Each structure stands twice: as structure tokens, then as C-alpha cells.
């Protein structure tokens, strides 16, 4: 659904068509003007950062594994005559429709008997999904993956690509897959009895030399070398695929460009009348196009074990019954062609729709992981109460759409209760300790991180014990639309730390809430604060991120009693464009204000600019008003004359309109 994913984008964000991606890492964000203030009994110290960049790093790598599951049939496409008043295939009108058609008379009785089983095999989501992946593999084919590269680095702990993804050879995305071609046979119209467990599709005119090569590779096993997101492992959809094309199927060309895959999709959707099938495949790919680079070192627990992708079995019986598909189809919603029409016009817009969906999910799974099991709406039972339909199993797209509904605070409506795609809530529901590997840089690591060893020499491979999952992404596109006090994503905020002159700089935060806001605002001001817990004896640093520049309470890496000693004569100025706290006395009052917002994207430590035309909000009415218009100007070549007009020179001629 293009419509619901479009509304997630911010108001200030004005996207263009083309986006020239030339790397496997993008820092999307915005530039804002922060007017910071520090008030005290001595006086006020004002600062101003005119261009403050708040970013979330997003990569094109992520371990996924496809499995073939059984899903509901999508009945949108079949002629409206055979359907009854309630909206199910009234068998008796099917036998009537087949009898009054251009079918062979000896096949009518035997084909009608099979109809009861074969007409309820309508799900082309798996085919469209694979054909969409082939489009983006050939478009962004020049992106590279190095084996010994830095997945994450925060100064203390480092995590390499070798650690998370073993059995991984370095190669380009184009050179990753070597897809073998499945057989594309021609359906004989005079076949005695239809062959079930072999799908048959429709086609307009002649199957081109390149269309054979695309359909051949789409219905085949994906066995990748490099762990890419749009080239993950998928099982063999089918062995053989029939195509009811009276004009013969040309043999396989071998080569094809990304423009030829768009040609193949547009013919397949139009012939089969499968637009709702495409809408399902569009939302599936939106989840599993890009995966987020973790905010903290201990936020890598989400991407340790491979999340399963639920691909519904390829099943289509249109080739055997050409009569039942015509120009008057049955559809539930009137805006059922909107998702395809959006993709054909603006293919590269999927990148923006993808980051909008994963940012919405991973933000909400952040503040869902911090609720006790003894509650009404908890970790296990947040999907059941929200869903008001009848899906087969609460997995895939249902779990991701219900998290988006919680974030935006609106009602998401789909025409069919389809349960296909990636399932994210895997590591959460387990409710056990996860052992993430790490290579150390400094020697004073295991004070900060909950490490397995207490003394570790530099360059050693250690393990961190993560119990509660910290947030993987900070809200950026969904900044101050549905604000919570955990993230504290306000435009205006203030904190009041109360100290007396008798205290020699040392302040104890009994409250946990205002400790989080103090440590966060001090980092905007470019000050390196290092607090020490009095009960346990561990240490926390506000500088625990190089992207957002905020301090969340989950950076403590421990749930206990709150007694944080902060010594305010060991505060060090780290960044540029900073206010100085030289020597405070009395009550401190910190405050900031974010005024304006400008969309910015970075890649390879350089600005990535949006190019091409101005993207519009395509509606169903905007095309069918031109159908209402029809260009009703009678196609008659009316040539109008020009009267020559003489003036002073007479050498040169001058023509007038009347």
C-alpha cells in the first residue's frame, strides 16, 4: 500500500524521483538550529549551533532466510458474474460460464469437476516479490561488500563483518547471485486433464526473448555468497511454469537490463488482473530492503540469529480457465490499482518508504521491550488485541503494520488479511540472554560493558551479555508527532539540577528521569560527563553514540537502584560549537529550542543530493478525469490560415494570426 507508507514521511520532506545510490551505507537525517542556554546564580551562558545533524545509519546487509508457507487465496481479479451476493465462488455459475465460452466441448465436464480445487489457488505474491528483487539487483549492482570491514565501532568495543556473517566471501551485488533458469513450457489448449502442482499464467500476445530469461530466474533458488538484503536465501518456487500464450514462447536470451523487468511485471499484472497480489509483494520488500546499523554496541542482539521470511507458495490456475478473467473484474476497494501505478511512475521512492517502516518498527520495539509481563498489553499479547480481522497466523506484515499503527496513532486498513513477509519480534519473545561477539580496542572496556572477562588485552575476541534489548534506532522521521518521555524528542525541554555551595561540585541524582535529560542536554552542549553508580560501582558515559547525539537510559546496561554520583570538576569540552561550564555555584538550569528543519542525506562522507522531477501524491481521480476527458477533441486535421500583412520595408514578409 503506497498510500499508508507515504503518510509516514515528514511534512518538510519534499522527495524527487531519482536517487543515485553508489554505496552500502546511507546516513539519512535532518539539519536543525539548536539555541542552548545555561542559567546559574553567577549568570547566563548562551550558545547556538546553526547546523546540527541528527542521523540514523542504514545499510544494505542483513541475514534473512525464506521458507514456503500456506496462505489464504486472493480472489480479486476473477469476473464479477460467478460471485454470489455474500462474495464467494457460487459453483453452478462457473459451469454456466465455461459452457457459454470458446472452450473445447469434450473438456467442459472434466475441467468443471477440477474447478472446486483449482479456482482457490490464487496467490502470485512470491513471483512478484522475486521479480522486484531482480529489478534492484541490476539497478544498484555496483555496490560492494568487504569481508574485513567495520560493522560497528564506538572507540571502546569494535564489531567486524566477519563476526556476524561467517561463510561470507567479499564480492559485488551483481557478482553475488548465479541464478539457474527454470523451464517455461507452452500450455497446449487441448490437454485432457489439468496438471495440479504446476502453475499456469496468462500473457498478452508473444512472450519476448528477455521475458523468458526473467520468469526463468524469478522461479529459481537464490544461493548468495555475500549477505545482501535484496539477495537473501529463497527456496525454489516451482520446477516448471506453463504460459497460455497462443503466440509461441521465444527461447531464453541470457542477458537483460533493469528496464526489461518493469516490462515483464506490467504485462503479468494486466493479463492476470493481480493488483492486490502486487500490493502484498510491495509491503513485503519494504520491510526487507534495508536493515539498520545498530545505535550502540549492545544493540546488535537483534541481528545475531537469522529472521525467517514467510513467502506464500506459488499457485495460479488462470492458464486452464481463460474465460473466467475478463475486463469486468471483482474488487473490494475502489483504489486497488494505486500501488502498481505509484511504483511504475517512481521506482526509487521504495527506498524512502522502506526506511520509514523499519524506523517506525524498531523505535516501538524499543519501548515495548521495557514493559513487565504481568500486564494487559505486554510483550506476548500486543498483536492479538490490535488485530480486528481473521488472519491464518499473527506473523509477517500483521506484526509490522500493528507497530506502525502504535507509532503514528492511526487505523491501518488492508483489503485481505494476508500474513506474509519478515517477522522481527524473534529475539524479544525468546526472553533469554544473547551472546554478541566483540573485538576490544582499549584495556579498560569491561567496566562500561557487561563483559564476560574482567581483564582483556587489546585485540582479543570477547563476549558481551545483553539481557534487555536497547533501542536499535532513534526517532528522526517520526520526531515530535507522538512524543514519549523515554526518548524525550521535544522541540523545547528544560532540567533543574539543585546544588548548594557547601557541596564541592558533587551532585547525587536520586531521580532517574532528570538524570537522563541532564546527561543528554550536556552532550548537545559538547561536554563529556562520566557518572559513577554508588550501589553497584559501574560507570556510564553520555558519549555512547556518534549519530543521534542523545543519551537514552538503556545506556546504563543495568536495572537496579538509582544513585548516580556526577563530579562537575572532571567535565571535558570535546566537540566544537559548545557552551563552557568553568565552575558552577548554586542551582543550574539547562534548556534548548529546535526552530527549523531541512532534510539531508550523507554517503561515503559526502552529501547525497536528490535529482529528477517533483514527486506528486498520485490519486485514482487524477488519471480517470483524463479518461472522462478521453481527449474528446474530434481527431480531424483542421488547418487554420495566416493573412500576410505588408509594412514599410516590403522586402521582408510578416504573418498575422487572423
Q: Could you say whether residue 261 binds its own copies (CB under 8 A)? A: no
Applying CB under 8 A, among 20, 51, 101, 645 the residue interacting with its own copies is: 101
User: How far apart are the C-alpha atoms of 359 and 305, rounded to whole Å?
Assistant: 20
Nearest approach, Cβ of residue 198 and its own copies (Å):
14
Q: Which is nearer to its own copies, 170 or 197 (CB)?
A: 197
Helix (H, G, I), strand (E, B) or coil at 526: coil
Q: Could you say whether residue 518 binds its own copies (CB under 8 A)? A: no
CB 12 within 8 A of CB 597: yes
Window 293-332: residues binding its own copies (CB under 8 A): 313, 315
Helices 397-408, 276-287: inter-axial angle, 10-degree rounding: 70
Smallest Cα–Cα separation from 304: which of 143, 151, 448? 151
User: How far apart are the C-alpha atoms of 203 and 654, rounded to whole Å?
Assistant: 57
Applying CB under 8 A, among 55, 56, 234, 288 the residue interacting with its own copies is: 234
Binding mask 494-513 for its own copies (x = CB under 8 A): --------------------
Residue-wise DSSP of 264-284: HHHHHHHHHT-SHHHHHHHHH
**How distant is the alpha carbon of residue 513 from its chain centre?**
32
Nearest approach, Cβ of residue 163 and its own copies (Å):
34
Q: Which is nearer to its own copies, 136 or 518 (CB)?
A: 136
Q: For its own copies, how many residues bind (rule: CB under 8 A)?
A: 58
CB-based burial, 599-633: b 16+ in 10 Å, e otherwise = bbebbeeeebebeeeebeebeeeeeeeeeeeeeee
Q: Which is nearer to its own copies, 226 or 274 (CB)?
A: 226
| Cell, residue 91 | 459453483
Nearest approach, Cβ of residue 380 and its own copies (Å):
16
Measured between alpha carbons, how far is residue 139 from residues 21, 134, 173, 227 in Å?
10, 9, 10, 18
Window 175-214: residues binding its own copies (CB under 8 A): 193, 201, 204-206, 208, 214
Q: Which is nearer to its own copies, 133 or 517 (CB)?
A: 133
CB 322 within 8 A of CB 244: yes
Q: Could you say whether residue 99 binds its own copies (CB under 8 A)? A: yes
Applying CB under 8 A, among 26, 32, 52, 134 the residue interacting with its own copies is: 134
User: How far apart are the C-alpha atoms of 267 and 12, rounded to whole Å?
Assistant: 37
Q: Could you say whether residue 159 binds its own copies (CB under 8 A)? A: no
CB-based burial, 477-501: b 16+ in 10 Å, e otherwise = bbbeeeeeeebbbeeebebebebee
Nearest approach, Cβ of residue 241 and its own copies (Å):
9
Nearest approach, Cβ of residue 264 and its own copies (Å):
24
Applying CB under 8 A, among 86, 100, 255, 390 the residue interacting with its own copies is: 390
Q: Which is nearer to its own copies, 133 or 523 (CB)?
A: 133
Q: Which is nearer to its own copies, 121 or 513 (CB)?
A: 121
Q: Could you say whether residue 137 binds its own copies (CB under 8 A)? A: yes
Helix (H, G, I), strand (E, B) or coil at 368: helix
Q: Round the CA-based radius of gyration of the chain to a whole number and report it.
A: 30
Q: Which residues bind its own copies (CB under 8 A)?
A: 70-73, 95, 99, 101-106, 108-110, 112-114, 116-117, 120-121, 123-124, 126-127, 130-131, 133-134, 136-137, 140, 145, 193, 201, 204-206, 208, 214, 217-219, 222, 226-228, 230-231, 234, 237, 246-247, 313, 315, 390, 392
Amino acid at each position: 500500500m503506497s498510500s499508508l507508507l507515504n503518510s509516514l514521511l515528514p511534512e518538510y520532506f519534499k522527495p524527487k524521483t531519482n536517487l543515485n545510490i553508489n554505496s552500502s551505507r546511507v546516513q539519512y537525517g535532518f539539519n536543525a538550529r539548536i539555541d542552548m542556554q545555561y542559567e546559574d546564580d553567577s549568570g547566563t551562558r548562551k550558545g547556538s549551533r546553526p547546523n546540527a545533524f541528527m542521523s540514523n545509519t542504514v545499510a544494505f546487509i542483513g541475514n534473512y532466510e525464506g521458507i514456503i508457507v500456506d496462505d489464504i487465496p486472493i480472489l480479486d481479479g476473477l469476473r464479477a458474474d460467478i460471485f454470489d451476493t455474500h462474495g464467494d465462488l457460487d459453483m453452478g455459475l462457473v459451469e454456466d460460464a465455461l459452457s457459454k465460452s470458446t472452450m473445447i466441448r469434450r473438456n467442459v465436464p472434466t475441467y468443471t469437476a477440477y474447478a472446486s480445487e483449482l479456482l482457490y489457488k490464487r496467490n502470485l505474491t512470491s513471483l512478484f516479490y522475486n521479480m522486484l528483487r531482480l529489478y534492484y539487483i541490476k539497478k544498484w549492482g555496483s555496490i560492494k561488500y568487504e569481508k574485513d570491514a567495520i560493522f560497528y565501532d564506538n572507540g571502546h568495543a569494535c564489531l567486524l563483518n566477519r563476526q556476524l556473517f561467517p561463510k561470507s566471501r567479499d564480492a559485488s551485488l551483481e557478482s553475488s547471485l548465479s541464478l539457474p533458469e527454470a523451464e517455461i513450457a507452452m500450455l497446449d489448449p487441448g490437454l485432457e486433464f489439468p496438471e495440479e502442482d504446476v502453475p499456469a499464467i496468462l500473457w498478452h500476445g508473444r512472450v519476448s526473448s528477455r521475458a523468458t530469461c526473467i520468469l526463468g530466474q524469478a522461479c529459481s533458488e537464490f544461493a548468495p555468497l555475500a549477505p545482501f538484503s535484496i539477495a537473501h536465501y529463497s527456496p525454489q518456487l516451482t520446477r516448471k511454469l506453463f504460459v497460455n500464450a497462443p503466440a509461441g514462447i521465444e527461447p531464453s536470451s541470457g542477458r537483460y537490463t533493469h528496464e526489461d523487468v518493469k516490462d515483464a511485471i506490467t504485462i503479468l499484472v494486466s493479463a492476470n488482473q493481480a493488483y492486490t497480489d502486487f500490493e502484498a509483494a510491495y509491503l513485503m520488500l519494504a520491510q526487507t530492503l534495508v536493515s539498520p546499523v545498530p545505535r550502540t554496541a549492545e544493540a546488535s542482539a537483534w541481528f545475531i540469529n537469522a529472521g525467517m521470511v514467510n513467502m506464500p507458495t506459488l499457485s495460479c490456475a488462470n492458464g486452464y480457465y481463460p474465460a473466467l478473467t475478463n475486463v469486468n473484474p471483482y474488487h473490494r476497494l475502489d483504489t486497488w490499482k494505486d500501488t502498481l501505478n505509484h511504483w511504475v511512475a517512481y521506482p526509487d521512492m521504495l527506498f524512502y518508504h522502506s526506511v520509514a517502516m523499519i524506523e517506525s518498527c524498531y523505535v516501538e520495539l524499543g519501548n515495548v521491550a521495557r514493559v513487565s509481563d504481568s500486564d494487559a498489553i505486554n510483550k506476548y499479547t500486543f498483536t492479538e488485541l490490535s488485530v480486528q480481522g481473521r488472519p491464518v497466523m499473527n506473523r509477517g506484515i500483521i506484526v509490522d503494520l500493528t507497530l506502525v499503527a502504535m507509532r503514528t496513532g492511526r487505523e491501518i486498513s488492508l483489503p485481505y488479511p494476508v500474513s506474509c513477509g519478515l517477522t522481527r519480534t524473534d529475539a524479544l519473545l525468546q526472553g533469554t540472554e544473547i551472546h554478541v561477539p566483540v573485538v576490544v580496542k582499549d584495556i579498560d572496556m569491561p567496566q562500561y560493558y557487561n563483559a564476560i572477562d574482567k581483564d582483556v588485552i587489546e585485540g582479543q575476541e570477547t563476549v558481551i551479555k545483553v539481557k534487555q534489548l536497547p533501542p536499535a534506532m532513534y526517532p528522526i522521521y517520526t520526531y515530535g508527532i507522538n512524543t514519549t518521555e523515554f526518548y524525550s524528542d521535544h522541540f523545547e525541554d528544560q532540567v533543574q539540577v539543585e546544588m548548594a555551595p557547601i557541596d564541592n561540585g558533587k551532585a547525587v541524582f536520586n531521580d532517574a528521569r532528570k538524570f537522563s535529560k541532564f546527561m543528554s542536554i550536556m552532550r548537545m552542549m559538547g561536554n563529556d560527563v562520566t557518572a559513577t553508580d554508588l550501589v553497584t560501582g559501574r560507570k556510564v558515559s553520555n558519549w555512547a553514540d556518534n549519530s543521534s547525539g542523545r543519551f537514552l537510559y538503556t545506556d546504563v546496561k543495568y536495572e537496579g537502584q538509582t544513585a548516580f554520583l556526577v563530579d562537575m570538576d572532571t567535565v571535558k569540552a570535546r566537540d566544537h560549537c559548545w557552551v563552557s561550564i568553568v565552575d558552577p555555584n548554586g542551582t543550574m538550569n539547562l534548556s534548548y529550542k529546535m526552530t527549523n528543519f531541512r532534510a539531508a542525506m550523507f554517503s561515503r562522507n559526502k552529501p547525497l543530493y536528490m535529482t529528477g522531477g517533483s514527486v506528486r501524491t498520485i490519486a485514482t481521480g487524477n488519471y480517470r478525469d483524463a479518461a472522462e476527458r478521453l481527449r474528446a477533441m474530434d481527431e480531424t486535421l483542421r488547418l487554420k490560415p495566416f493573412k500576410i500583412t505588408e509594412k514599410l520595408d516590403f522586402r521582408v514578409a510578416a504573418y498575422a494570426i487572423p
